[PDB]
Amino acid sequence: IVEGSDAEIGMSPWQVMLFRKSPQELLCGASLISDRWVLTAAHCLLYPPWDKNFTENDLLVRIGKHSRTRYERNIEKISMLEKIYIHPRYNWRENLDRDIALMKLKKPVAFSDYIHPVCLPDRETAASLLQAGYKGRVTGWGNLKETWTANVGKGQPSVLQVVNLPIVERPVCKDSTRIRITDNMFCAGYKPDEGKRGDACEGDSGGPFVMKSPFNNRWYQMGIVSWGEGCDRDGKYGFYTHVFRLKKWIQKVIDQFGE
Amino acid sequence: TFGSGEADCGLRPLFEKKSLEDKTERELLESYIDGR
Amino acid sequence: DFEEIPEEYL
Ligand SMILES: *C(=O)[C@H](CCCCC(=N)N)[C@H]1c2cc(-c3ccc(O)cc3)ccc2C[C@@H]1O
Numbered sequence: 527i528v529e530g531s532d533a534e535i536g537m538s539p540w541q542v543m544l545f546r547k548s549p550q551e552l553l554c555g556a557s558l559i560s561d562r563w564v565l566t567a568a569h570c571l572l573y574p575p576w577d578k579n580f581t582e583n584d585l586l587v588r589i590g591k592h593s594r595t596r597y598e599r600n601i602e603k604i605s606m607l608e609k610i611y612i613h614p615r616y617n618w619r620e621n622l623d624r625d626i627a628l629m630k631l632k633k634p635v636a637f638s639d640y641i642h643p644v645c646l647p648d649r650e651t652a653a654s655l656l657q658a659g660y661k662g663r664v665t666g667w668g669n670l671k672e673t674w675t676a677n678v679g680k681g682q683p684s685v686l687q688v689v690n691l692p693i694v695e696r697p698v699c700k701d702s703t704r705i706r707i708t709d710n711m712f713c714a715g716y717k718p719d720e721g722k723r724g725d726a727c728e729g730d731s732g733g734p735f736v737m738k739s740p741f742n743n744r745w746y747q748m749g750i751v752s753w754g755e756g757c758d759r760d761g762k763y764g765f766y767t768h769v770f771r772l773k774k775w776i777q778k779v780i781d782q783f784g785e
Numbered sequence: 786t787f788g789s790g791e792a793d794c795g796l797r798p799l800f801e802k803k804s805l806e807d808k809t810e811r812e813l814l815e816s817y818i819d820g821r
Numbered sequence: 822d823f824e825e826i827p828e829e830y831l
Contacts, residue, residue, distance in 0.1 A: 537797070539797055560789030597825065606830070645795035663809075690813060738810060739795075744801075
């Protein structure tokens with residue numbers, strides 16, 4: 527995350543780290559949506575242009591974390607994946623449309639002060655909150671400056687970072703890019719003239735864009751970090767998977783198996 | 786029940802459950818036509 | 822770069 531700040535402890539207890547076994551590395555962010563289900567972006571697992579194709583055994587999920595690199599001994603839990611489900615119409619050939627995947631954990635996690643699931647939006651929550659100008663919040667351990675085109679400075683965080691970003695109007699999203707934007711995406715970020723900045727960046731993909739409902743004071747995941755052109759470039763925006771529009775498929779997979 | 790299990794989703798043990806706010810969540814709520 | 826994780830997780 528570019529231009530954000532260190533998270534408080536327990537500020538984001540649904541944040542999950544996607545970690546590969548060998549070589550041990552951070553792949554992506556993710557989120558905890560119940561005791562045995564994790565939500566992420568499909569491109570974290572499966573991306574043929576780059577010969578990426580992770581299976582269950584390639585991966586660990588780490589939950590409860592704050593520090594990026596430390597093994598957080600009585601705090602984090604590590605889990606194994608039973609099964610990965612990618613959306614059957616994820617469009618990796620063109621524009622990362624339907625960039626979403628579910629992961630089933632081998633055994634349930636216990637919740638704690640540091641480990642707690644986020645809610646998924648219902649229709650009326652999506653409709654109220656998903657509005658241009660409303661701010662949401664993105665979290666992650668990814669790069670602090672664009673090495674997604676070789677920037678330096680600080681590089682990589684020691685702790686989870688956080689940034690709050692306004693949702694942008696669709697016209698302005700589509701006029702920032704040459705990529706074809708679908709109804710399964712939204713964008714977010716500050717305009718060049720606003721004076722604030724900030725963005726997701728490499729290693730942040732797959733994690734949560736969340737908002738807090740003013741009606742019931744709960745946190746809901748509205749987006750998944752999906753793609754962007756660069757990190758924190760002026761006149762460019764972050765694009766996110768639209769979680770409510772894909773909620774039928776989410777309910778399908780968690781209903782069909784399914785205990 | 787409720788969804789998968791929770792029910793308790795979206796309420797953070799260290800914050801909402803103890804009625805404590807984090808240090809920037811006001812920025813979010815202020816953007817939701819502030820409210821009042 | 823990562824601290825080492827416990828072998829039961831591999
Ligand atoms: C995840 O960490 C990156 C990018 C996350 C940050 C997004 C942002 N700056 N708002 C991932 C990524 C991005 C692409 C992509 C596809 C299509 C484009 O037009 C631009 C970029 C493809 C693949 C990846 C892998 C990486 O996980």
